[PDB]
A and B are shown apart, each in its own frame.
With several copies, the nearest count.
Chain A
Amino acid sequence: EFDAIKIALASPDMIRSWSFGEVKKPETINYRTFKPERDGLFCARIFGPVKDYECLCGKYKRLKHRGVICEKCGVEVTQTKVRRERMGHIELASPTAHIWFLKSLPSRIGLLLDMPLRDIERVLYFESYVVIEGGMTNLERQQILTEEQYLDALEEFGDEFDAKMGAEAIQALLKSMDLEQECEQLREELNETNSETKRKKLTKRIKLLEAFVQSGNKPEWMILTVLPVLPPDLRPLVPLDGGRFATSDLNDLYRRVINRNNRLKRLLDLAAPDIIVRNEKRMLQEAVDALLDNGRRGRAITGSNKRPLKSLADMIKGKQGRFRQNLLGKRVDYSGRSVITVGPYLRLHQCGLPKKMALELFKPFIYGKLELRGLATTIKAAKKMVEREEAVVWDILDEVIREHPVLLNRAPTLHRLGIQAFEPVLIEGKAIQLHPLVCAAYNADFDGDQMAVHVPLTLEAQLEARALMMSTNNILSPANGEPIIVPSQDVVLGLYYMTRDCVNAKGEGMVLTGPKEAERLYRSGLASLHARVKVRITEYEKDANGELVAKTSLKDTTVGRAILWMIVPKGLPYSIVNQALGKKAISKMLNTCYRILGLKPTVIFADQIMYTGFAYAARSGASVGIDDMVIPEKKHEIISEAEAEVAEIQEQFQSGLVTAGERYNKVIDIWAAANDRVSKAMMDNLQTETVINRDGQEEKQVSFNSIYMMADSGARGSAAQIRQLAGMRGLMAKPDGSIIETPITANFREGLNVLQYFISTHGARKGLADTALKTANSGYLTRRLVDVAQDLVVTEDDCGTHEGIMMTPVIEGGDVKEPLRDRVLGRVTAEDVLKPGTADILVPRNTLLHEQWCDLLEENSVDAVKVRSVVSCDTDFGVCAHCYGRDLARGHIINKGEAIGVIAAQSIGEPGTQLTSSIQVKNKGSIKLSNVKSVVNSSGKLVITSRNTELKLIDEFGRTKESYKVPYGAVLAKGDGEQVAGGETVANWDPHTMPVITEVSGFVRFTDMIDGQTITRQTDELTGLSSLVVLDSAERTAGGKDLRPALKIVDAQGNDVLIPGTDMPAQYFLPGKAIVQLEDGVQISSGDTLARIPQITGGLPRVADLFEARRPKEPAILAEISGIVSFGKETKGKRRLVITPVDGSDPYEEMIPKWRQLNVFEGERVERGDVISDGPEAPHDILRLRGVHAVTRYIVNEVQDVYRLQGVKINDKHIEVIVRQMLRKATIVNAGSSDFLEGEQVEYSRVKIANRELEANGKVGATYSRDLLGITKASLATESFISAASFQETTRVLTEAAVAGKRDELRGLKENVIVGRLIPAGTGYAYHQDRMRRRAA
């Protein structure tokens, strides 16, 4: 019926055409029979009838008289639902300005009229006069005069001078303004003048005025003359039960406005004095402003008793506004909720449902079935039978609920798996049963949790719920390609107990012909559950081309494992059930069985595993007792030794040998060592405490303790819990944040005292508060992340691009924390891979790297494969399937139409509640260096004169195992390609002071320095070395500020020493506080010391700042372009950074603070994007200097490092999608041929397509620079104003929309949800495509 929405500002004529009448009286009802009064806020003749086809006076009360208006009262005879869409108007007696356009964050009227907001408010407040059309009176067009000045001007001239005051004057000025003349004058000023601020202001003014001219709005329409009235029903006056009434605040605001307008009309008729007229006008302005937006201009008007009134803007805005509370989410029918239970007998695709809940839900279906079967003659009879609950309604319900799925949802929906579909099973009771396997996905427990039930209604909804939301259809997590239905506690414990051999048991060394007779021997009581026996087994292998090959052999296994072999599907080797079978082993087995067989065997195997684990756990019957906590016999001795050491340290402190801080450090270190010793001793005593003897002397095996098994099967508990149960719990933390020097020496088995309990209460309360706040922060972060990438949908199949992202393993200077298999599996390669030896062609370019390809790459030991990404996709308004890769929730490739942005945001935001000098080589390798300007010194060490040198360790496979940053002028023992051994020091340096060594040899002479002017003469008291300390600019005098100490190496002939390979002299201008090691008259050598210059938040605010693109507090200065450096003259500051290129000009200059240390020397050539200072790096500068790849790599690396430190595994595809969404806007440098401004900021896709069209034609394209914005800024800057208004700043968004006259095409998901139609993401993608292809055919 429609395809777009248009927003603008309403003219008085249009407002009058909207109105069905005028409202002249504030009367509501007649307090007797509650009839609607005439010409009131609920006037029947204006707003339609009250009852259906009933006249107000009663004359006409039948449908026969529909359409004719009464003559006694005028009330039209029609439906009463027209009272909900009919509006009135009020004729104001004086013009009133609009509060939104006056008090919006940018003063629209103020900057349109080039008048200050303060002055405009002064004129509106009836304080000062304003001149309009001054003429030849020597008065400006916007000059403001006081009362005395206006009187003086009127006395001199009675004509050719017009002055008004207030909204009338503002409207007159707006009408008199000439938009075209203002545009041409501002363009001429832009062309003539040259200033940054003036240019920006004139550009904003020209843009606003050009958009106003393009739109059909008029400047004078911003001042309200006729205002609309809300329909009665939207502000009801219904009688409350008990003879009382309920009313909204809009009725009172309208009453106030009407009464003040009537008073103003009366005063104007009665020729009231000017002061009274002005007071009444001010009251009317205030009343209209408070009606439109209460509390914006001044103090809010209080309501009936205490609370302030609610305005239309208040209803529109807020979390409880229409957009968020009643339009984005809405209460729905056919819903139910109750408490959940386990019901372990259920299958994965079914759940339990109470009979009463299903009878109440499927009432229309039962009615229809009863009518169709002929049991009930009428729907009323069917309802009576259902109320009576006969014996046939239950059969009808069983028939209808046989194959009708339902929806189960938990109140926190963190990710996609918060809502699933199941197949109902009628049960007796009032509690829902939920499958244990989906409990981890649902994040639900059984301590009073509740869940909601939703019934799909239509055929399409039922089929969608069966094919997409079914529990068996989603077993893999969308965040990471891992199973999500793995057993947690009871099944894991049962399988661990089953598959756990013993040294000596019943029937040891028995030869078994099959697991069948193994279970025989188990059940019959003639053999133990776990005894070492020989069993003949047959296994099947898929080595053939889809066929299975059977092989039979004798294996060494146990009875438990042989019995468990029955449920394994006939596709897996026997080695996957011949271990302890913990939780990780169970998950790996499930994943292997999935990836090898398919889906149905996976779910069947999972159900069989859960059944067997439950049964065998119940058969074992493990318990917990007070004797399970075994106390070591050395705890007291260790405590005594620790106390003796503490006493000795206290005596030493009392002797004055050590300070308080050193004493505290020693005490805490001793206590930590004692705690570690106690924990290690108790681990050793508990882990192998079970000792037995088989047919001989004695032997030791793993312990049989119940708590040890519980902690070693990964079901529950951990090392920290065991330490807190059977040993001291360590050091606590005072409320200040430090650590108390006295630890807690008592465990939970023994009795803690009041002091230790009171100490632990602090940590318990801190933990509870942190847990309370983490959820509140994560909700906001998740909402902000979802709202920025909700419009991203896969729309193409292959964009045909050649770009990609270079993927390498993560090395931090030690052990690899991210193998290359994880970062490459599931991605498509951007370029064809070659052989490791660069001899033959490897896997082709456009292949999908599955597990087989990954295994082949691992076997071949490929160093680094490059892959495509979504940030380099060429698809406009979406991404292609090939660039995205594959959906890491199903085995196949990503389908077309999927709204990947929502999945990415949900996966990123779900684990948010979980978040709070000498190089020593590790392993043998070959020393490798990259970008090193090394030279041989006089001692043989390979000194390095480059600040971009990375130390790398390459093994004989050709893989990188180590990565270190080498400081400048560092001593290196080895070289490049020299074989070394593990644990060998190769590099040494002084971190407390960087060297100023030179790369050339010769003489050092003293030129351009005077003792006292720039240097001081100081003698060391201890060492006695004579050195000349260089004073900085502030320490020295003003005369010597232009004479920097210049040290230059000269040879024996007196000339400057030429650097090998070049001829530029190497002179170094020492900065302040530069201690010179050697004086004049002593020859030096290359690589020798000459001068010495002295030199992380937790949680996820780092993640929040990274996603919001917040600039660092102390950004690192970077080099704009490559070239030499030419220090600048102090200009009320430290230095001027001027970089001279090889041949280009050097207009660039920077303001360097004097409190920041600098690294570059006088004659050092810098590169583009190279660092000049030290500190946090700014992402905007990173982008501007190194493209988009560097900044997306930096963001991905930072977020992955934070999540890995927190222990959460998330794929980087989501991060990449978020970065792409954040990298959507771009500014214009200069327009080649297409109309564009020099600083306008538009969408990147628009300029891209415009440039493609220009290049296809004979014209010349333009140039642009990519811009980086935060998530909220990108969400606010959206082509569709509806989505922007739904998120935040509704008043500002609506004001800007109205002013610009913007047109909104739906073209999205949130807009289609708001309007109430099919979204173009799932099944509606094809409908939307068909609609687009039909339109403009």
Chain B
Amino acid sequence: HARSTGSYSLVTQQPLGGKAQFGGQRFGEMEVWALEAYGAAYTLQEMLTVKSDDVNGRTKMYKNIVDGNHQMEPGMPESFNVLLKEIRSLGINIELEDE
């Protein structure tokens, strides 16, 4: 099985399962720990932001690859926004300050 681009889940904009919905492999906590043991900070960032969650990130990267430019923008993952909204639904106030 192999995938480059496909469909994404509804609640969290992430790839689907395996070989049934034409989905991608899963990058787990052990793999994250291995990449942290390595010095591949850029690889980890492009793994957990552009290829998975950043809605504008993935399309921008696709357009840059088609145009021949190997560069990316990190953006912000949708999963963290979903988590923030879920926490704000309780009686807990969490926010990001700019300074």
Contacts and interface: CB of A to CB of B under 8 A. Distances in A.
Indicate if A touches B (C-beta under 8 A).
yes
Contact of A229 (B29, B79, B89, B94): B89
A332 B15 contact: yes
Given A236-B11, A465-B43, A1315 B80 contact: yes
Contact of A98 (B39, B47, B91): B91
A10 B25 contact: no
A458 B46 contact: yes
Contacts of A364: 4, 62, 65-66
A336 B71 contact: no
A906 B33 contact: yes
Contacts of A414: 30
A6 B95 contact: yes
Contact of B25 (A98, A335, A412): A335
A300 interface: no
Interface of A: 1-11, 14, 18, 85, 87, 98, 100, 221-222, 224, 227-231, 233-234, 236, 238, 292, 312, 315-316, 322-324, 326-338, 356-357, 360-365, 367-368, 371-372, 379, 409, 412-416, 418-419, 452-454, 456-462, 464-465, 468-469, 478, 783, 786, 790, 897-899, 902-903, 906, 1294, 1298, 1309, 1313-1319, 1321-1325
**Among all A-B residue pairs, the 9 with the closest Cβ atoms:** A1322-B39, A413-B30, A336-B2, A335-B25, A360-B2, A10-B93, A1324-B41, A331-B15, A460-B42
Most buried by B among A224, A326, A454: A326
B14 A238 contact: no
Contact of A458 (B6, B38, B71): B71
Given A4-B97, A364-B66, A1316 B36 contact: no
Contacts of A357: 2
Nearest to B68: A368
Chain B contact-residue range equals 35 or more
A765 to B, nearest CB: 30
Chain A binding site: helix, strand, loop or mixed by DSSP? mixed
5 contacts: A5-B94, A338-B1, A460-B42, A469-B38, A906-B33
B93 A413 contact: no
A1324 B32 contact: no
Chain B binding site: helix, strand, loop or mixed by DSSP? mixed
Nearest to B23: A331
B30 to A, nearest CB: 4
Interface of B: 1-6, 10-12, 14-16, 18, 23-53, 58, 61-62, 65-68, 70-72, 74-77, 79-83, 85-99
Nearest to A462: B70
Contact of A457 (B14, B48, B65, B91): B65
A627 to B, nearest CB: 48
Given A5-B95, A315-B86, A1323-B41, 11 more contacts: A9-B93, A10-B91, A292-B90, A331-B52, A332-B51, A363-B4, A368-B65, A419-B38, A1313-B32, A1313-B36, A1323-B39
B38 A330 contact: no
A461 B37 contact: no
B24 A332 contact: yes
A1319 B83 contact: no
Contacts of B86: 230, 234, 312, 315-316, 322
B94 to A, nearest CB: 5
Contacts of A315: 86
B40 A468 contact: yes
A555 to B, nearest CB: 46
B12 to A, nearest CB: 5
Contacts of A330: 14, 26-27, 48, 52-53, 79
A972 to B, nearest CB: 54
A224 to B, nearest CB: 6
B94 A1318 contact: no
A344 to B, nearest CB: 25
B36 A1319 contact: yes
B24 A331 contact: yes
A2 B49 contact: no
A8 B93 contact: yes
Contacts of B27: 329-332, 454
Contact of A10 (B48, B51, B88, B99): B88
Given A338-B1, A1298-B92, A1314-B80, A413 B45 contact: no
Contacts of B70: 457-459, 462
Contacts of B5: 333, 363
B32 A419 contact: no
B82 A234 contact: yes
A368 B67 contact: yes
B99 A459 contact: no
Most buried by B among A85, A234, A461, A902: A461
A6 B97 contact: yes
Contacts of B52: 330-333
A331 B44 contact: no
A336 B25 contact: yes
A331 B25 contact: yes
A322 B79 contact: yes
A99 to B, nearest CB: 10
Contacts of A361: 2-4
Nearest to A229: B89
A1309 B16 contact: no
Contact of B80 (A85, A227, A1316): A1316
Contacts of B46: 456-458, 461
B75 to A, nearest CB: 8
A230 B89 contact: yes
Contact of A333 (B3, B10, B33, B77): B3
Given A364-B65, A413-B30, A1318-B45, A87 B85 contact: yes
B73 to A, nearest CB: 10
Contacts of B15: 331-333
A336 B43 contact: no
Given A334-B4, A413-B33, A1309-B36, A1316 B92 contact: no
Contact of B40 (A7, A331, A461): A461
Contact of B51 (A334, A371, A902): A334
A419 B31 contact: yes
Most buried by B among A10, A85, A222: A10
Contacts of A7: 92-94
B11 A224 contact: no
Contact of B85 (A1, A234, A326): A234
A360 B3 contact: yes
Contacts of B4: 333-334, 360-364
Given A333-B24, A335-B25, A364-B65, A328 B32 contact: yes
B88 A18 contact: yes
Contacts of B30: 412-414, 418
B61 A457 contact: yes
Contacts of B18: 337
A1275 to B, nearest CB: 15
Contacts of B41: 464, 1318-1319, 1321-1325
Contacts of B45: 1316-1318, 1324
B23 to A, nearest CB: 7
Contacts of A229: 89
Contacts of A1322: 36, 38-41
Contacts of A233: 11
A326 B29 contact: no
A458 to B, nearest CB: 5
Contacts of B40: 461, 464-465, 468-469, 1322-1323
Nearest to B77: A1316
B61 to A, nearest CB: 6
